[PDB]
Design a protein around this ligand. Sequence first.
Ligand SMILES: O=C[C@H](O)[C@H](O)[C@H](O)[C@H](O)CO
Ligand SMILES: O=C[C@H](O)[C@H](O)[C@H](O)[C@H](O)CO
Ligand SMILES: O=C[C@H](O)[C@H](O)[C@H](O)[C@H](O)CO
Ligand SMILES: O=C[C@H](O)[C@H](O)[C@H](O)[C@H](O)CO
Lengths: 389, 389, 389, 389
Amino acid sequence: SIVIASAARTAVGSFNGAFANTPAHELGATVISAVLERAGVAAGEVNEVILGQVLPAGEGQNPARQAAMKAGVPQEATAWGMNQLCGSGLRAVALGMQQIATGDASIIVAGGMESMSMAPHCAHLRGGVKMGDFKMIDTMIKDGLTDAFYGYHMGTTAENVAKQWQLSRDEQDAFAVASQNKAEAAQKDGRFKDEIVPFIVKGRKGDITVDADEYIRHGATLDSMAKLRPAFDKEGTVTAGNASGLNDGAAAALLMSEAEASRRGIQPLGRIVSWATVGVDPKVMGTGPIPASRKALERAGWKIGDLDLVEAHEAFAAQACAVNKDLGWDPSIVNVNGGAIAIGHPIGASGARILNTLLFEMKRRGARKGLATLCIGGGMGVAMCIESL
Amino acid sequence: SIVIASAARTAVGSFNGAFANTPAHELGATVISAVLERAGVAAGEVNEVILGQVLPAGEGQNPARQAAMKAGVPQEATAWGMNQLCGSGLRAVALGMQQIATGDASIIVAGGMESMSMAPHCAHLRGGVKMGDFKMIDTMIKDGLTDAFYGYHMGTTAENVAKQWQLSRDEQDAFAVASQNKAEAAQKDGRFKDEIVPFIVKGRKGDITVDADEYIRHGATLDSMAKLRPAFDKEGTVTAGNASGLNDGAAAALLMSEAEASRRGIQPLGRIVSWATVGVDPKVMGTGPIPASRKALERAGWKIGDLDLVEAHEAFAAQACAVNKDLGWDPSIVNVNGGAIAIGHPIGASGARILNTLLFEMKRRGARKGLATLCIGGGMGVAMCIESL
Amino acid sequence: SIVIASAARTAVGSFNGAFANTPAHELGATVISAVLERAGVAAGEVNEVILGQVLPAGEGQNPARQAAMKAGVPQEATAWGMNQLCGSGLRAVALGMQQIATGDASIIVAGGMESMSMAPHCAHLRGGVKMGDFKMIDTMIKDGLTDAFYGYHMGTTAENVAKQWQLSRDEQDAFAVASQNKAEAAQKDGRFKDEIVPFIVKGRKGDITVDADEYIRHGATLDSMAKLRPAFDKEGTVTAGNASGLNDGAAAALLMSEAEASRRGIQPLGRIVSWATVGVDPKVMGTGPIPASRKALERAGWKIGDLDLVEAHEAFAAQACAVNKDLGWDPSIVNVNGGAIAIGHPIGASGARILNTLLFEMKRRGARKGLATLCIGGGMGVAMCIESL
Amino acid sequence: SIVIASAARTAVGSFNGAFANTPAHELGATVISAVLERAGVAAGEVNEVILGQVLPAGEGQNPARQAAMKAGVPQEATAWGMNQLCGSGLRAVALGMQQIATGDASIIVAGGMESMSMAPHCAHLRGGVKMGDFKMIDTMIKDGLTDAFYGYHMGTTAENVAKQWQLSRDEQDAFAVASQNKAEAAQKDGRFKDEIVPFIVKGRKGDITVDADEYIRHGATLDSMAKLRPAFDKEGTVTAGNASGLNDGAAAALLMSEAEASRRGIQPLGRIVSWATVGVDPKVMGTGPIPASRKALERAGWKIGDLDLVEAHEAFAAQACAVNKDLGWDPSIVNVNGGAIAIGHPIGASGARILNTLLFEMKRRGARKGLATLCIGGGMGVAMCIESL
Ligand SMILES: O=C[C@H](O)[C@H](O)[C@H](O)[C@H](O)CO
Ligand SMILES: O=C[C@H](O)[C@H](O)[C@H](O)[C@H](O)CO
Ligand SMILES: O=C[C@H](O)[C@H](O)[C@H](O)[C@H](O)CO
Ligand SMILES: O=C[C@H](O)[C@H](O)[C@H](O)[C@H](O)CO
């Protein structure tokens, strides 16, 4: 029914790094063109653009639209942004999939984009301030990284899950180092070249082409991971090393009916067979994927043993390990090329980013069945099933 | 197929007025409760809450999820926000329709919220500011009022439409007072009492109940509308008198299959027969309603003559007339109880606000075929056709 | 040797009151003009202007020089500011007196000025702020009212003194009401008319002439005082009612040699016979006046008994009482026209402010020997002795 | 009668460089300790610390006092800051001299300190920001480098002087290069070691010791200067290269009567024979040292020809060439070790900074008579004559 005709993403950039000054809509713009040209479809053919974004502050009216306009998409089309936090970039893919199934559209471009570097500090000042200090609020931390119900960082929700499943520091660090090692394996082999479209950072001191994930750490040993201090709980287990990072990047994909694909002689990356989203307790948001992944598989009629490959968001090694333990899928088909702990996590784009990894890694190894899932801040989960054509 | 079990909106505050310090999701929580109470349907049964919101800076993670949790929707359910600007509120409703239509969900609460009053000031400050003055940005104007392509205010795009459709000062001023007269009337007549759900402003000075819109200016005369200066073009014609304002507010509707309402013994306010959205030159964004409505009507198999009522958002008396004159529809069924010019413009919510005034009026007067439509900064429109039983 | 030929002060404005948007150097300018006029001295004769100012942030380069230049003092002259906190306005006069004594200048305008209302919020942002919240600091509170070593407000050092001297809530409130009542009586009787020069607050819808000290409460009751809660210690004794206020104001004096005075035929307001400054423990800064007054008196060769009139700065009722008991002078000759609790406390100006009150009350009643004294945050005192010619 | 017993300054850091996060009173503290140590005088014997500072916003109550307390000066002492802009640090020495001359003190530590790096941005926000963007003001530029009467940068007053004296870009850039080469030679030779007291920048990740002036360019070229664009008038002459810099530092001298020094067996750095301050046209503030020096020499009874060494502040190549031109002293006794173009210009400290360089160079070369002099924004000059004992 609905295929993903084509994909693309920038490389994930380190916090205040390669894209320290790049607006999200501009990474979304480049990423939009990539899927247009990779599929040989013209921007004058895109009905609408759906883009996940969690930190829009200061970017101006409807960033999703600036990204489509800059991308070359004609004005007679439509564009919009959305936010289911970390799951945003993949929920957009499912939302675009729904515009087509209801016949409200032929061709959608869907994904997400985040610039955590460009997120401003804010303060409500209309009332004036007669006397005393006031706080300038970091929107990245407040709107993206802090639980609105329990008042603490997502790193604390990860300490909770850790306690639940009794995950030792050692095990988490092992997972963390494996992630970094698998990504360093995939980077130096070229398995990210395909899915990555280079981004040119226009500049005054001379242009700059960025086409490599800069967050990945090389020579990451168990030892280097064990010298780290806890980053949330002083007697805890969660560290900077065994947890995702703060990053910049974007990721989209082109959607059309399977028949449309055939009309244009296009060889899609996969068919979207099912998706699903379920809520859990914010205190243990890390558990999101389990109910989400099983719901998805149910709607697909698949068994967890039918999966050839899995991309499972690495918010924290803590929650990552506990999700694997329960679902029991072969941990040698999960995050084959490493995950967020190494690749980074530009929130709003992340769900569409691992979709990119999942799809291109299915094409090169010939896998037929794949799943992508992420935990979500505020206690949610989301998952999707892709089938190779 | 898909019906609106019920609906509810808060009263619309004045900028820095009655909801001066009320966070968006607070107004949303009340409204979510409101649709559930009015339909007699437990919170647990809600699958997902969908809310438009344009100004979320500083309000914390996924404000849509916050509205649901305070309203009492269980953690099991899911929530997310989205941003198609002025159409956001009406877009969540259709999207809520699609969740059910594609069988992914049974019961949806959709609508819009907006605290233009709580919207903060911001600046990017991570790269440092080595030397020299800088600007602290007003998020309300930056992300809500200013065109991201041509660098100017919505009022300047309303002016463009004026020059184009040769609309004059009088035609506009006549439209504004007629709108301020119809509203004041409807309010006195008690015509808003059913849709509005009272919000308590929990204060220290004393708990205040807000049960009426406060932007409605009584005794509006053309004489007083004429003593006004132009604030967009010195020698122009668009005045604060003939344009909507900055406003706070929230609105919503409970969605479910028509058979579902049936088995649940619920008498629905309408059925959503279709919807659409199209793009247009950003510089004349006020024309949005024109293609979008011609789109939605077609999908409904209706002729303009078939409509017995209409709700067309009152951004500016300029864009508004140009709509009325292009479609031809009978102006005396357009905005029977006043418009945003008189009522207010809580951006993200205006799409869900007008749906309410439409549905309760379609029911008060027994109209059969309705339609709500807005224009959207950036150059778009959203349309949707309603039908009672 | 050195005399005060003339003096003058603006009325003292309430916080964000009469001078809400009047920069301090404007108040200084009116006051420089008044002392010149009152003395029969031309601006072109002024060698140097010296002004205490504690909170100059944002006012531009050398506000002292701005006041002088706006006053018509010629470019050939010099001007500078200085900061010894609450003592600034008095110290500046001593410093002025020293330029003359060492033969370095003939004619000096000395005093201080302060707009607490115009003090800005601020933040260090040159290195950026990687991530996380940051405070916009209130320069008034930070640079004016907080101790730099122990981190608490001046009102806490007042508690410290209240415990040290065992001063009851009741004794302090009585002192509080007495100050207010004396000031109101002095105001109605016209006792402030001589010293005060009217200030014209320029407007567009009407200039306003301010010539009355607006911080003085009329008909103040002990009950209004007793009903207030401690403001610095939850089970404390210092309240907003028994403390000084935040205010705007300027005050100055024109110095020249006694012989230069005689040559001109001016009948001076007084001869400066000595001054002193001494440090104390920051924790109990309120006690600064004790050692300072004692050193000033010894330098003058006077006994405490020789004083006919005293002006001792009322930072807080607590410290004022402790100084009076410690020094032992008849309280009936101290702050005979009220003090800072009623009149207000423009930090940089206060020392000259109370010099003004001392001087005109001395001439009024024919008192031969006077003393002015203030406590200083950070733990210091300053005192000056004056004798009539 | 008054001698300089000892002197010290920190190295001068570059804008946001070695002292980027070091508060100014911390630099001052170190220098106070150094002069005490170098003289053989105990902290317990200090009566008063007087420190020039132009940018104290956000640093807390009376930074002069924080430095004295941090340095170990007893609480019974006193401390105050003052501001005559660029002249502050030298004036402070004259002022301390006057305390001793008038018999009010015996031992004074006087100088200046500045952290241009740590100066904050600011805004007046009490009245309330109605709606829309407001300016965050850079205190350094506003209160340090901008003229309060004509609105433009100090670099523009230098263009004024350039045109007036017809100084080419060539003569200025020649002066700029010569200043850098002299200071580099003096640094290489160790001529700054005597005056500099090392500073320890505390660091969680290590302590760094700063004992070299870091603004100084090594091997500066004529071509490096010639390349630059004028910074203040597009067809002008003054550039970043021929102008002084933005820097951090502190500097001081320890003062006592000649007779006191003799009692203690101290061999002083010099006798203070006279000082003078004089105003000029703000438009041409750079010319300030001309009348100040003449008046100082006239007060000392010296001919310009009697000077053996001279330190004349290098605000701008343009103004320094003019001063030398009108005064006519052998340029080969002026800034024998380079000046502020090379070494830097920490506003409040620079006047003591040049005092230090003159004092130690006088001692090494055996010069009998010397002069230090600075121009001052807003139109003033200060100078001081020193003779060897
Ligand atoms: O000794 C001279 C005086 O200071 C003035 O003449 C006096 O203060 C008057 O109030 C003038 O208005
Ligand atoms: O390292 C120590 C100092 O460089 C000297 O003691 C200095 O010359 C003093 O100022 C002497 O008065
Ligand atoms: O406008 C003033 C004159 O033109 C002179 O420049 C003046 O006497 C200055 O104070 C000295 O430079
Ligand atoms: O004593 C030697 C000095 O290095 C020179 O005097 C210096 O170069 C002059 O200031 C420029 O002519």
